[PDB]
RNA sequence: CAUAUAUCCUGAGAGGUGAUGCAUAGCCGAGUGAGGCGAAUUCGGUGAUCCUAUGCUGCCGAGAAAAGCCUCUAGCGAGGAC
RNA sequence: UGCAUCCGGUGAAGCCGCCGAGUGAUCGAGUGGUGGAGGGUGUGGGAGUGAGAAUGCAGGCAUGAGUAGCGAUUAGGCAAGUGAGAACCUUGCCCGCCGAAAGACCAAGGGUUCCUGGGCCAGGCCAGUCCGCCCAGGGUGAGUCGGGACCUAAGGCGAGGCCG
RNA sequence: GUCAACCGAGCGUUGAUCCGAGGAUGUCCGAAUGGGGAAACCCGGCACGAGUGAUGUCGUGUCACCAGGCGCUGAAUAUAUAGGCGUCUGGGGGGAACGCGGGGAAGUGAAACAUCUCAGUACCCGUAGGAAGAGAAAACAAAAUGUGAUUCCGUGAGUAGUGGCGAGCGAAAGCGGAGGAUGGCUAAACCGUAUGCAUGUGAUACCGGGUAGGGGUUGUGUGUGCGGGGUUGUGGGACCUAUCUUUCCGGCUCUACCUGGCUGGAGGGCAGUGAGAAAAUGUUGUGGUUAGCGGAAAUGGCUUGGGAUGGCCUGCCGUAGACGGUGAGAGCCCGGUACGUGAAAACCCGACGUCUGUCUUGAUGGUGUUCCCGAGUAGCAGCGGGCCCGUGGAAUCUGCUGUGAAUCUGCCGGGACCACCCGGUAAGCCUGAAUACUUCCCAGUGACCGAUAGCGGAUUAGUACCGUGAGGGAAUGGUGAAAAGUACCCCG
């Protein structure tokens, strides 16, 4: 069998200067499965979170090419969303910011 | 972490809760990794090989 | 020419020209003539593209039989 | 039955609203740049290669399709529209 | 290489020399140096067996030569700073150039070149504290934009099919 | 895991890492197959399930096309078919070489060139299999009481011959050998049964004789299927026929009656997963393969040396002195070697049997006539191909087009052809071994290369790079025994 939880999709939380002023507006950002969609997102982290989630917004990032004596070499090809809560929305701790 | 001797004695709705709650602390256990609050890396790799153990005799119960 | 179904009567290949010797390629396709065969069981016709020898044969064994044989070979 | 400054449609643009807002010339210190306050905002003129315009006129060389939209019924129909 | 012998970390080969030898290719179980591990001799066997030339091939290095050139038609300068180091970087003030462009925005294309921080033996036709260079990290948020999920054109693929 | 360390975490005799086998999972593309598509990315339907206040969303399955079966339906249109719907089974693509069948160059050589050669090469196409193909005489041979499937090897022989008789090409028989299965089935004629089609002294006609029913052992024909029966050349086989005649029982044998064939059961053989019919099933082989394990004998002395694996001297093992490693030439330090062990499971070979098939109502050997012995075939002609044979007197073989027979006193071949004689018995099928090859795997070898060599590739290698693309296509090895990889100070 396969068991479908949402943490699947939500691989992991985003950590930077932009993330965090995000995360002062009530904004967060995390790095999700590359195939994933935006409404499968808003339902993961609302039944994760048990949060109400008001947008969810997807950038996908290219990995960059970097370069080594061999030739060169690319990162992998991440997928952000960006996930706004609802007003209240009891926020978040998981982030350690 | 746990054993394939002591997950076949479960049932299967247990193992499905195990599976949820191994997940559950995979999750937990990458975003304590991004923001650097975890020592213990191989948590992930243990975690992970439960997953796949958990599956594994599900997998197994359903064929024979 | 056209290859035929209840036969198989395919081309031959040869080189074909006199006086110099020189043998220049050539073909020697069957006499494949377009015929509506009828099965009398079921009086329509359908056209096949079927050799003169197939038409000999076919006329001496009756579209029947021979039918029987073509679709038991399991060709159109 | 009518030839209608009738009616309908289309439609630039004007005006209103949007706008008790926003922005701004400038002023305060602050001097990394964080901010804060904030005047009047009417008249004309010129004037588009842009808009009305997928128009109008003229011409021959005689100028995409399909979706879409509208309508028709066939049909569905006991719930349905606004 | 077969066989038999011999030498060798008490220093083989290779290389550089000295002193010499042979009619010649060449020799040196004569010597030193360097070096560090396999070689010599005889007798046979077999050869990828000998180069100076092929406008030969590859590598390295010369000659020209510290020579030409250092890539437009705009033009740079002063002060101050930074720094080991400044014509070139930074700031300010001047001057000058474009101004249907040498401005601003896109597509195509490129693909991270963007931003921050750091660096400076390569690159930049000089130098370099600078950089489109190097390193690390970050950065691209769409119901309405451009596209798909709507439509078809040319054209393409083309169930079956026909023809071959 | 590693380049390749470092950091941080941990695991492990409660047996990790690692090795082998079997399984599970196995995104997306790709035959690619739900549909689309610029390959690896876009959009879905249906069913089930989850999730939502519901739409959205998620997951699991499934959904290509074609062929062949099976079932339903059966257009124009009536028969009916084409087709449509459903389901099931399969294919599809890749692969280094080898194979079979087809197609088929040119450079070149001929000192030109066209015939010819190159060459049936390269290339292409279609197809396979682990081998293939061929193969059980319508053969060879030459009068020998001959051989006796096929393939392959060597010879025959660079011969006979062929050839613008030029360049060149080039057999076969026969012989010696490998391997041996001189192997096995069938169609036909006759019966029997079933069935389709058309019909019916429709009864004196449907078993074998005679009686009686029966209204058909159809009056039948005719075609097909099935089963028998028959598979050959000294011709054989069938139909008739006659002598002998190895098992038992039952039911049919149109019907009951005596007597002639068939069909079931039983003892038994005979074979078998094979070409000769086909699967499954077990038990079981110190049989094998896929991990490995053990495995003798020097801390020997002296000396040199950084180090002994050198030298000198002592011993020792040796079914082990193979090859490597270890601080320099190590049998006795290590991995190992000789040698010997080892498989839970999977797989492959066997054996034993279940089981399957067949014979078993059977054969034996004889006598004289009709029937059969593979048909659009052979043969013939025309044009061609290939055979040594280049159309020549050109057989044999073979493609196309026409024409077109005979079934044994028949037909084919024995190098035009005729006669005789001999051999064989086409037009139907199968068939192992000897033979060819190596993408890949294992173990090994080299008077093979040893980094401009050897694979292009010891290194980032089909990479970087070049090119739109097909495609082309590099260079780059060595510190040292051990990083002990130069702390620290000085110039900078």
Redesign the pocket.
């Known amino acids: 069998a396969?068991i479908?939880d949402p943490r699947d999709i939500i691989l992991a939380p985003?950590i930077?200067?932009?993330?965090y002023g995000?995360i002062e507006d009530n904004?967060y950002t995390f790095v999700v499965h590359p195939?994933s969609?935006?409404?499968?997102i808003?339902?993961a982290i609302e039944?994760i979170f048990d949060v109400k989630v008001d947008?969810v917004?997807?950038?996908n990032?290219?990995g960059?090419?970097?370069?080594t004596?061999?030739?060169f070499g690319k990162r992998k090809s991440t997928k952000?969303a960006?996930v706004?809560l609802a007003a209240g929305s009891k926020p978040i701790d998981l982030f350690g910011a | 972490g746990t054993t394939p001797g002591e997950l076949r004695e479960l049932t299967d709705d247990e193992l499905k809760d195990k599976l949820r709650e191994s997940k559950e602390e995979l999750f937990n256990l990458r975003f304590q990794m991004a923001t650097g609050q975890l020592?213990?890396?191989?948590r992930l790799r243990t975690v992970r090989q439960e997953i796949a153990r958990v599956?594994?005799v599900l997998?197994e119960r359903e064929?024979g | 020419?056209?290859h035929c179904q209840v036969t198989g009567?395919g081309?031959?290949?040869?080189?074909?020209?006199?006086h110099?010797?020189?043998?220049t390629?050539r073909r020697?396709?069957?006499?494949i003539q377009n015929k509506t065969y009828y099965l009398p069981?079921?009086?329509?016709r359908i056209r096949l593209?079927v050799?003169?020898?197939g038409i000999?044969?076919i006329d001496?064994?009756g579209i029947e039989?021979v039918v029987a044989r073509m679709?038991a070979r399991?060709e159109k």
């Open positions: 396969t479908t985003v930077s200067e932009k993330s995000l904004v195939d969609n935006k409404t499968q808003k339902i039944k947008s917004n997807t950038a990032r290219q960059k090419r970097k370069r004596r061999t030739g952000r960006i706004k | 020592s213990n890396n191989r599956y594994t997998r064929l | 020419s056209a009567r081309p031959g290949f040869g080189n074909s020209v006199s110099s010797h020189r043998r390629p020697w396709d069957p006499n069981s079921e009086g329509r593209r050799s003169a020898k000999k044969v001496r064994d039989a679709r399991g």
